[PDB]
Amino acid sequence: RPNLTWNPVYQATTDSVANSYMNVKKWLPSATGNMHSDPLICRPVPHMTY
Amino acid sequence: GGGGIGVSTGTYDNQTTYKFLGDGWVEITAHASRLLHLGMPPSENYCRVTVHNNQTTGHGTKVKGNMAYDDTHQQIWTPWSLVDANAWGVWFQPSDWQFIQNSMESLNLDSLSQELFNVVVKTVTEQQGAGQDAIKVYNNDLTACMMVALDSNNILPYTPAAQTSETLGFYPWKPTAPAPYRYYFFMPRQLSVTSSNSAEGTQITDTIGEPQALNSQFFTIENTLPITLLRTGDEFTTGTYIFNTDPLKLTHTWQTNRHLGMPPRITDLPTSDTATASLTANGDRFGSTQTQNVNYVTEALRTRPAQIGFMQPHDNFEANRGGPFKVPVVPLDITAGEDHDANGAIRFNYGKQHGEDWAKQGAAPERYTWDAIDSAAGRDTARCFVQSAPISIPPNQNQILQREDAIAGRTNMHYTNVFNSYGPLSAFPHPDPIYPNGQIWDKELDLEHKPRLHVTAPFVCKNNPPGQLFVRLGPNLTDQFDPNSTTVSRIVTYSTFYWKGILKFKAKLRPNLTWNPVYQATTDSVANSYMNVKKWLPSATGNMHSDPLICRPVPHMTY
Amino acid sequence: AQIGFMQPHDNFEANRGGPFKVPVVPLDITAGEDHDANGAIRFNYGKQHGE
Amino acid sequence: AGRTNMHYTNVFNSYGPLSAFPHPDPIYPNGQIWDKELDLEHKPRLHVTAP
Amino acid sequence: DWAKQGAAPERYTWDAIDSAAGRDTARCFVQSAPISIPPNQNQILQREDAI
Amino acid sequence: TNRHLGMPPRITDLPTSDTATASLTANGDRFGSTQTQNVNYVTEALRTRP
Amino acid sequence: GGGGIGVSTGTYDNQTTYKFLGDGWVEITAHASRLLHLGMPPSENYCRVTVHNNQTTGHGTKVKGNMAYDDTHQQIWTPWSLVDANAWGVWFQPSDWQFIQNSMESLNLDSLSQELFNVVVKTVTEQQGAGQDAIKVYNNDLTACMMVALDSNNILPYTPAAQTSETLGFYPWKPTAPAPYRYYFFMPRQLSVTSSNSAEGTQITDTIGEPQALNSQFFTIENTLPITLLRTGDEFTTGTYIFNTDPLKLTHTWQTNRHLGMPPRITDLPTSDTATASLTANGDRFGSTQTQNVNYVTEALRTRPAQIGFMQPHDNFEANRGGPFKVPVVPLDITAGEDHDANGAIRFNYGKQHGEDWAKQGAAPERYTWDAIDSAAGRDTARCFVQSAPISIPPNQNQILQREDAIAGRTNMHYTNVFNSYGPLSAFPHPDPIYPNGQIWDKELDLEHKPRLHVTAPFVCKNNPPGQLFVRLGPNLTDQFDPNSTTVSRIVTYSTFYWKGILKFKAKLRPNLTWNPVYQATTDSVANSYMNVKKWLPSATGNMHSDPLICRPVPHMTY
Ligand SMILES: CC(=O)N[C@@H]1[C@@H](O)[C@H](O[C@H]2O[C@H](CO)[C@H](O)[C@H](O[C@]3(C(=O)O)C[C@H](O)[C@@H](NC(C)=O)[C@H]([C@H](O)[C@H](O)CO)O3)[C@H]2O)[C@@H](CO)O[C@H]1O
Ligand SMILES: CC(=O)N[C@@H]1[C@@H](O)[C@H](O[C@H]2O[C@H](CO)[C@H](O)[C@H](O[C@]3(C(=O)O)C[C@H](O)[C@@H](NC(C)=O)[C@H]([C@H](O)[C@H](O)CO)O3)[C@H]2O)[C@@H](CO)O[C@H]1O
Numbered sequence A: 001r002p003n004l005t006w007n008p009v010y011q012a013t014t015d016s017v018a019n020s021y022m023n024v025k026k027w028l029p030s031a032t033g034n035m036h037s038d039p040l041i042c043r044p045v046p047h048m049t050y
Numbered sequence B, G: 001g002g003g004g005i006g007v008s009t010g011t012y013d014n015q016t017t018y019k020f021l022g023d024g025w026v027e028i029t030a031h032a033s034r035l036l037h038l039g040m041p042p043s044e045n046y047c048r049v050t051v052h053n054n055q056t057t058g059h060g061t062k063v064k065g066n067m068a069y070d071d072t073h074q075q076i077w078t079p080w081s082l083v084d085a086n087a088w089g090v091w092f093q094p095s096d097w098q099f100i101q102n103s104m105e106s107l108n109l110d111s112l113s114q115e116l117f118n119v120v121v122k123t124v125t126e127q128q129g130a131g132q133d134a135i136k137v138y139n140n141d142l143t144a145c146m147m148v149a150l151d152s153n154n155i156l157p158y159t160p161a162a163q164t165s166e167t168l169g170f171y172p173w174k175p176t177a178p179a180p181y182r183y184y185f186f187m188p189r190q191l192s193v194t195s196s197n198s199a200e201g202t203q204i205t206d207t208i209g210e211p212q213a214l215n216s217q218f219f220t221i222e223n224t225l226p227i228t229l230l231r232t233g234d235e236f237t238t239g240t241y242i243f244n245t246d247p248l249k250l251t252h253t254w255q256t257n258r259h260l261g262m263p264p265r266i267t268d269l270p271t272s273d274t275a276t277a278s279l280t281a282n283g284d285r286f287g288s289t290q291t292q293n294v295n296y297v298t299e300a301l302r303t304r305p306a307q308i309g310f311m312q313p314h315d316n317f318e319a320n321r322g323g324p325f326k327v328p329v330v331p332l333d334i335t336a337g338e339d340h341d342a343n344g345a346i347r348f349n350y351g352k353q354h355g356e357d358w359a360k361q362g363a364a365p366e367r368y369t370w371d372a373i374d375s376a377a378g379r380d381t382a383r384c385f386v387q388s389a390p391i392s393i394p395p396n397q398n399q400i401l402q403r404e405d406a407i408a409g410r411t412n413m414h415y416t417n418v419f420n421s422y423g424p425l426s427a428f429p430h431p432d433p434i435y436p437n438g439q440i441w442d443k444e445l446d447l448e449h450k451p452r453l454h455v456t457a458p459f460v461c462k463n464n465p466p467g468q469l470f471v472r473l474g475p476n477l478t479d480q481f482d483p484n485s486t487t488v489s490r491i492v493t494y495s496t497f498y499w500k501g502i503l504k505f506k507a508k509l510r511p512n513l514t515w516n517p518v519y520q521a522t523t524d525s526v527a528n529s530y531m532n533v534k535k536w537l538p539s540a541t542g543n544m545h546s547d548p549l550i551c552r553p554v555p556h557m558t559y
Numbered sequence C: 001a002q003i004g005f006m007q008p009h010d011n012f013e014a015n016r017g018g019p020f021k022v023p024v025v026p027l028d029i030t031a032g033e034d035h036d037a038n039g040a041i042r043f044n045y046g047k048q049h050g051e
Numbered sequence D: 001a002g003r004t005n006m007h008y009t010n011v012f013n014s015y016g017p018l019s020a021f022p023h024p025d026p027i028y029p030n031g032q033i034w035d036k037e038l039d040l041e042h043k044p045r046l047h048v049t050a051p
Numbered sequence E: 001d002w003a004k005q006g007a008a009p010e011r012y013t014w015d016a017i018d019s020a021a022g023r024d025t026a027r028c029f030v031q032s033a034p035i036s037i038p039p040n041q042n043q044i045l046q047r048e049d050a051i
Numbered sequence F: 001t002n003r004h005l006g007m008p009p010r011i012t013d014l015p016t017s018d019t020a021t022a023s024l025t026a027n028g029d030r031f032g033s034t035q036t037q038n039v040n041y042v043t044e045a046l047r048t049r050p
């Protein structure tokens, strides 16, 4: 993608905030090995239409 | 050498040349030159300005039913200005338009080249005089520079000035000015839908939101475009853009679904010139219909190849995260019912530089409504009707949906307002060009899938539109400058520069194959006539006005 | 996607040339025998064409 | 609109970007074979009279 | 989630990331031409209007 | 959206304070194009969009 | 020919181009252009100025225990100014930084080129007006000249302005100014070490010394550098410097000594997701330790290959012939104890041109503390402890040196303050770059033996750094000039010139080999969030602020 905007752009990122849809814990294996893959965001960068 | 402060850096040329090539092909090269006045930007800072009309009185949005008066939005104000010349009037004398409309059958864009020359930057100083009437002295800042930028890759938001009537002037002998460049910035916007009859307690929700990262884009001319500094003896050239577009028909249609295919056979020829003719009994007549409950064929029930034109929802004020908006309507024939909104008539407001009578005093702008010249795809809402199948002719009050029929108990609401007949059989003409207050070319929308046509311009660049030309005056700093201070004392400075553009068109002479004489755009001397030549003649005081001219005067057979 | 589509019935639109039955894409009358809703084509012919 | 025999179906158009329909069937022997296209800058997807 | 016990399947609703082509039905409205601003209860088709 | 297409309306003057809004030219005196003729004013909502 | 007063002598270019070469290599060419305002030097004489704060009150050095407030020093003031652009913000939009941080894994300097163009020298004259409000008239001195010098051989003292926040502005649309060049001159300096609790009679020794030949060096730009006189139609070019430096990692580490090597084998897998696991009895566990008094192996006693990070003396105010100075500390992780000083956190104070909210009123500068993004080499002083050999676990109050233990009877003094664990096994990460208030490159110290790294910049030229650019306005003498007189009547004169620089970088795209999603630098719309996009968006009044952005967001395996 090209970068031509002064303002920083929104990017898909994980966090450590508790009960956060993006808590890395979700994409990490459990102690028993249980794994889950919740849907990830797409098209995070905006583009000018006109 | 070539560069010099005392030498001119360009040539004023404003003439439309016609080169007839052959087989009826015409190369129309339109030269346009204008003098531009640029001043210092009130601020040298990019600004995120918010406009919000929450007034609880007048045309505010806290007034029940003023939803349409919504002018709320956020925009990035830029110290840069824009030299936009995308309007038919900036490229052709009224006569040129007439010749093309009356003699040519097709017109397509070819190439565009633009040049900035003869830059003059001047400083204003005030000398003290008697009566305390300080005189203003204008001096030449030979070393001063004007910043010029061209966005060829079209990275910055496209802003056609024609819509705001902020394009260059339509009169080559009058000075002009560029338009301050500005672009919308996403801002959450929600406005409740109410009515003048809504309960007094009804609370209207007029709310604006804080910037959202997912949709926040801030661009600066400096961090995106290469900027050329222009001094008195400097010139700018934009090269030669090539237009890749679809040709525009200079002819109108007239054939409705009732004029498609072999007409019904008359029994016998009319007896007298004042006599009508008779067809075979509908029951005995041969033909094809799509209604089976009936055992007869009538011109109205006859199956036609397709649908010329289509019904369009009226005042469909849709609403997104950006507030309510009038859904655009394909410009078609208002018909004999003069149903402008039903057919998308375009009413535009303009100023003296764009054809308002210079004599006209008062701020009130000139307002003209453009009705499509087309006479084939229009819809007369008052005559349109829907019947119940199995078709029963004649029907009863409960077997037909006439327009007067109220919808949802709203007396003035009719199915026509919410009826969309667009389908795979809908066939309509393309928007007519509007000299001289009409945008010529337009940028396509970067959506994976796009609209069939744009209601604002007859031409849509099929790839990348001509680059926007940006101009600004640099801060003329004084002796006192604190880089850590917001305030920036600056020398009053203005600049004048000449702009020249060359727009080329590929047109083709129209064929003449009709016995009857054809309708042509002509002027007259009849008093109070929209075409009284006096209108396009200079006044005694020199006042000039250019009222819109007709287009597509010659009809062409549709089927 | 959508196989087929609903089509306005007896949309008699009107221009400068008078009223006209809007054509309907010929589709399946279905088990409801909805001919007009699906644009059934009824044609009238003479001896030279199969009468 | 209080019309007993009028139903939303009569004024309902579901044509959209997802609508997919077959093309008109030829009708031996009383059927037009070829047809002329309409000289409109933009044209219909198909003609109901000819395949 | 492998831990999630019970037959009940995992259910997720995907909302389009797009923020430009959506339609807020509650805010959408249709007015009568000739347009009269501000309109009266009989000059505007608000959503709450029953059909 | 359609409300973010084309050159925005010209603000009369820049906002005075960071907490201040801006004013446009009177809709009656404002220049522009609409598809509604029963009205003699141009409003961002009534503005003709491509 | 090419030279002319009316012709421009350069092009404004401020865009970051990204050229993807292959195998993931990226050529990042950063163009930066700024308008500079230069004024007449208050004096045209080089001056040996002495600063000495001997006040017996307030923040003076005759106050017991104000040793740290020492600002005493001698400097050679020069009529010359310096065009320094050694700061990350002067070369990249906030977005550019984010893209590089989130997508690239390495970054190295390549080449640097600088150009001075469009020189404009103007004179200020005052005309008498009513109300005795003399107006200031600004005229063009076409024949005036601006003196430019480049010290490529680096003979003059190196002065990175970034440290004084005196580099060029970080906003390309705002005018900027160079920084007055000045360099320290050796001056004997001795200050006694006292405490707020010292005896009232305690006499503090605050003494300064006379210049010492053994250490006296006076340099003048004129007698050391070739000077280029620049007139309105003149241009300066510094050529293309080539950077010979070591690449910078754009990734952080997380592995401490407790995360090095094969982990201990769990007896059995955890039973429930909420259950922990058990290892083999430390007595029966296999492994290697460096403590023999114990017959067991514990993760903490396990022998590790080396030492990730190291303890550093706190506030080691060492003292030479130049007075006391805070010994620098390798920037590391403040850890969960937030031990900033123990880990060398960098707190910097800057002004509007460098990211202070333009709205912020008051002289008070913006103050930000930079904590190293690293999470592996930090030291939590509160948790650190030293035990006595033969190791006795658990130890007694006399067998362990906990932090709270006072040293030399000073209650708040702890061994940690005087403990240095740097050794042959110490392994630490290199200083993180700090957009946008961070020095990029730095000069190496001409000592026969040099430091492993510099705490001020991520890049150290391994040979000779880019030459410093010096600019000054020549004395505009009047009619009255006495060469034998010290006083020099001069015409008020100021100059404005455009600076353009091209900095090129060799970067490499990061690899993705982890199942879990990776942490990326992102903005949000959450209210009062350090990353609320509103911060990097222009205000309604145009106020702009650039708060520091995170770096090295992606982690990399250390061992
Ligand atoms: C006569 C009738 O049955 N109804 C008219 C109706 O036509 C009229 O609408 C327009 O026509 C009048 C005719 O005088 C007038 O033109 C109106 O307003 C102006 C305008 O918008 O300012 C007057 C301007 O002078 C004119 N422009 C020029 C330079 O001639 C424009 C322009 O011609 C018009 O916008 C084209 O559509 O029209 C028109 O709105 C309305 C007026 O309320 O009602 C009856 O008078
Ligand atoms: C809070 C409010 O105003 N209204 C909520 C409404 O949002 C909620 O709908 C969803 O949100 C809740 C929030 O806890 C919950 O997520 C609901 O149901 C589940 C589901 O469908 O099973 C729970 C799942 O755990 C979740 N998936 C995972 C793995 O996290 C899914 C999924 O997030 C969701 O389908 C995405 O749309 O949601 C959601 O339906 C409804 C619930 O009745 O009403 C209020 O609680």
Ligand SMILES: CC(=O)N[C@@H]1[C@@H](O)[C@H](O[C@H]2O[C@H](CO)[C@H](O)[C@H](O[C@]3(C(=O)O)C[C@H](O)[C@@H](NC(C)=O)[C@H]([C@H](O)[C@H](O)CO)O3)[C@H]2O)[C@@H](CO)O[C@H]1O
Pocket: G366, G367, G368, G369, G370, G547
């Ligand atoms: C909350 C707690 O346990 N202790 C806080 C402690 O964090 C705080 O130190 C800093 O954090 C506060 C939080 O509001 C504030 O940021 C302090 O001072 C400022 C400053 O130095 O001027 C305020 C500025 O607005 C800010 N910069 C900007 C533009 O946001 C800077 C900057 O964020 C900071 O220097 C980064 O380290 O901080 C901080 O010093 C102290 C304050 O005494 O004690 C508790 O409040």
